[PDB]
Design a protein around this nucleic acid. Structure first.
Length: 105
RNA sequence: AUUUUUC
């Protein structure tokens, strides 16, 4: 698949997958487009430090991997997968941080 | 080598 995943169209912002807390020191672009291609047609993919991105053809494909791979282990670590326009995590760089509305009370 | 963008 292509190397592009940063569009901002009203259907490309929800046909995309965010992949945080990723084992980016063992994974590669040829791995991310091979771990998420089982849940949809990838037409763009990119990888960075601590996170990566995947661009599907539609939103249905994104919900397939955002609910099909989220919380899975790869290369010995777990990755936090979510819709690219529906962030809920505090981006605490470890997943240990909580929201002021989701605290222990 | 470590959570929203071109590895």
């Amino acid at each position: 698949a292509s190397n592009v995943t940063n569009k901002t169209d009203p259907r490309s912002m929800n046909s995309r997958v965010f992949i945080g807390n990723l084992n980016t020191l063992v994974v590669k672009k040829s791995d991310v487009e091979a771990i998420f291609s089982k849940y949809g047609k990838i037409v763009g993919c990119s990888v960075h430090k601590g996170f990566a991105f995947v661009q599907y053809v539609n939103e249905r494909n994104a919900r397939a991997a955002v609910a099909g791979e989220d919380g899975r282990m790869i290369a010995g670590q777990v990755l936090d997968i979510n819709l690219a326009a529906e962030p809920k995590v505090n981006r605490g760089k470890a997943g240990v941080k909580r929201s002021a509305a989701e605290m222990y009370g």
